[PDB]
RNA sequence: UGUAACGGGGCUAAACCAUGCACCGAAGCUGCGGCAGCGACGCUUAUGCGUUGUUGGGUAGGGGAGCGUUCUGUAAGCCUGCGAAGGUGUGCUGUGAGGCAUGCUGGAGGUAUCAGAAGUGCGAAUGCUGACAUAAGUAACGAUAAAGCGGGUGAAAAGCCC
RNA sequence: CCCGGCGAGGGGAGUGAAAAAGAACCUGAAACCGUGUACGUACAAGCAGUGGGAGCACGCUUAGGCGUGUGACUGCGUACC
């Protein structure tokens, strides 16, 4: 093989979620957090 | 790896302003108002595809009604006679003949009048 | 022949110079020079200077025939606007623009 | 192929005479509006004025049904402080005799430039004379 | 006193349409000088209806 | 960011936006929101994963016939024209030459050659095996990579 | 001289020799599609209307091309509810040259 | 505030009631053309190919699949001063992010394919910096102690010198 | 060399491969300001578009019509977050 033919097995990489990137990515504009509240704030959330 | 997003923002704004070439005022120049104008033009094109499919049928109905009433039968009894004589010529072609050739439309009036009474 | 002559960074506004520039667009050059002579505007003096420079360049750098000549195309565009600061009441400043302009005249026989 | 449309420079028109004696105002004005829009011709397209010219003789003999001679009121506002005027029907027979048919046909037309042109086609006259004899108006009967 | 939203180039151009400076009609030709001047004004060198009034 | 801890104006009263400090990443000449750091991106592979991967790479190299075995690869002089000649004879423009003892007389005359790398039997790495257009090893190094991997 | 027939669930009033663009027909280019499903045949003033698929007369057409139309763009947009959708569409067609009007 | 309690014209029916038949009427349904998902079914499962039924409005959200930008490997290879990037048009192309070809400007860099890492995608944050608009050739020209003429200088004089 | 105030600024000539590389100097975008040409616009009312569409304007051309620009007249239609 050459070094530009090694592909991973299918389902290895998932490429992740990128929150806040528009209407088309699904999540975006609140990025999955929903609307206001303690769970929506920067560094928000209850303790264990 | 820092990405400078100038060239792609220029491509993205020119992609809009080439579509809004022809609107009045700063809907042709300003990117923001041209963006609103472009999506509003898209919604209008969708709704007006449906509206065209209604409006042209109502135009053909008005033409068939006028050309039939000139020949001596009203429109509703014309279509009743054309269906009870089993003629499946839809209204676009009937309006086309009703404008172009009065002879075949008069023959269709005779067939409908014979089929009615 | 085009015989362009321009004056760049003319220290006056572009609009006020443009007002007298719309006077002589499409004239025979003698009527233009006398009508810029008898105008009561400073921009008339500016465009008269540019017009004599254009007429002299059209008679010098190529051959002749001043009487044939007709001002085809004159235009004034806006030049580099320089900034100052105007002090106003209650401590707030105002950035005011001293505006400059480019005057350009193009005369020809046809 | 597309559908047919009437080009405005191709339009032919006819001239007509209506006798309004004893025919009621609304039904006569209805037939005038139907003839004025061009809905009697097969070459009808809604953005082109196609309807015929119409001349009306005997415009103050036109009668209304029931008690409408004395009770129907034709309001209009002068656009002022609160000066809103009116007239009854027979006062409009006396004062502005053709204007009853003018308002009654203007109410039944589309509102815009094209409605204004097809209202310009209407030539009402109170007297039994008409100066459009050089136009040769034939007779149509509602 | 404050404006509401900004007008266009048309509503500026319509208002600036009335600022068109018109010229003089034609200059008078003097009798004895041949020089141009305005009507009822003296020339640039001083003659006026054939009368050297400022010399 | 080299800057002060002071608000550029009042909180309420001035018509501009609220602002806490001139260092916040919204402003110009103040910056990076999520700052990058000196870090280490090296990630772990098992011994058996690396060993099986090298076994797979060598077996695939044999099944593509790039792996050539000679008994002794011998130059006596460290002049690079000699090694260029010996690779001119065997039609090898670009090689990876694994040896079992890294004798200095071949490591010397390969350093000015770009297309030639000469490594030791313990020095086998995957991307340089895959990278070069030919891989030659002494049979001594064949036995040595038999003993080290298995 | 015109014949009224049905091609793609809809009617066309064709004339002899001219071309019409209609629905996609699974037919190679150098071929001939026949329509016995004519609804009216008019020549001169001798007209033929009938209870449909009238009698005898047919239409014989030779396919010219199979191009797609110009791209229509479909934009759905809901005001202030964070949803827009863009979707192109290009419709197939078939160009036929009507070359026969029967009895 | 202007008729102003049919939407208006107008209607003694173009109103109300009863029977009845035509007809119009939506993105409903049928027809024709195309896309995608799911369930089964078999062809020999390049887990594809086909036959069939069915489904496809969507916010918060959940899941799947992609396009593009910078840098690294492939790449001391490829394109390129008989013209690269960038700029600006035009024309084809895809379901979409987009791509491809090419006119003109430019005057020396860009980079296939497949992988990898991300300062990776802006219309809004009374966002930040810069440029420029609008009001606009509009208000104002900073004490109501006051200027007028002649001569000079200069291309030009109400303001400078006498 | 010429206009110009023995100015600024410009038109020539010249250097340079290039001067729309001229010291405000590689490329040179958009907003903004114009000049010219084609069409529309001085009795017609509104998120300024869109569906239909006449006429004119250049281009061609299997001489049928298409293409691009303007789009009178018209049904629908109360911006984005």
Write the layout of secondary structure elements.
This is part of a larger assembly, with seven protein chains of seven kinds.
Chain A: no helix or strand
Chain C: E1 4-10, H1 14-21, E2 27-28, H2 29-37, H3 42-60, E3 70-78, E4 82-83, E5 86-87, E6 93-94, E7 97-98, E8 101-108
Antiparallel strand pairs in C: 1-8, 2-3, 3-8, 4-7, 5-6
Chain E: H1 9-16, E1 28-29, E2 36-37, E3 47-48, E4 51-52
Antiparallel strand pairs in E: 1-2, 3-4
Chain B binds two RNA strands through helix 1, helix 2 and helix 3.
Q: Your description of this structure?
A:
The structure is cut from a larger assembly and holds seven protein chains of seven kinds. Chain B has 117 residues and is mostly helical. Chain B has one domain (1-117). Chain B is rod-shaped. Helix content of chain B is 75%, strand content 0%. Chain C is an alpha+beta fold. Chain C has one domain: Ribosomal protein L22/L17 (Ribosomal Protein L22, Chain A, Alpha-Beta Complex), CATH 3.90.470. Chain C has helices at 14-21, 29-37, 42-60, and strands at residues 4-10, 27-28, 70-78, 82-83, 86-87, 93-94, 97-98, 101-108. The relative contact order of chain C is 0.29. Chain D contains five helices and six strands; from the N terminus they run βαβαββαααββ. A four-stranded parallel β-sheet of chain D has the order 5-2-1-6. Chain D has a two-stranded antiparallel sheet with strand order 3-4. Chain D is globular. By secondary structure, chain G is mostly beta strands. Chain G has strands at 2-6, 11-15, 19-22, 32-35, 38-43, 46-49, 59-65, 72-78, 83-89, 94-101. In chain G, strand 5 and strand 6 form a beta hairpin. Chains in contact: A-F, B-D, B-G, C-E. Chain B binds chain G through residues 39, 42-43, 45-46, 49, 85-90, 92-93, 96-97, 101, 103-104, 107-108, 111, and chain G through 4, 6, 10-11, 13, 39-40, 42, 45, 47, 49, 51-52, 72-77, 84, 86. Chain B binds two RNA strands through helix 1, helix 2 and helix 3. Chain C: Belongs to the universal ribosomal protein uL22 family. Chain C: This is Large ribosomal subunit protein uL22. Chain C: One of its GO terms (molecular function) is structural constituent of ribosome. Chain C: InterPro entries: Ribosomal_uL22, Ribosomal_uL22_bac/chlpt-type, Ribosomal_uL22_bac/org-type, Ribosomal_uL22_CS, Ribosomal_uL22_sf.
Q: How would you name the oligomeric state of the polypeptide chains in this document?
A: part of a larger assembly
The chain pair forming the largest interface, with residue counts per chain, is: B-G, 22 and 21 residues
The tally of domains of chain D stands at 1
Largest sheet of chain D: 4 strands, parallel
Strand % of chain D is 5-15%
How many β-strand stretches of chain D? 6
Protein name (chain A): Large ribosomal subunit protein uL15
Family (chain A): Belongs to the universal ribosomal protein uL15 family.
Subunit structure (chain A): Part of the 50S ribosomal subunit. Contacts the 5S rRNA.
Function (chain A): This protein binds the 5S rRNA. It is required for the late stages of subunit assembly, and is essential for 5S rRNA assembly onto the ribosome.
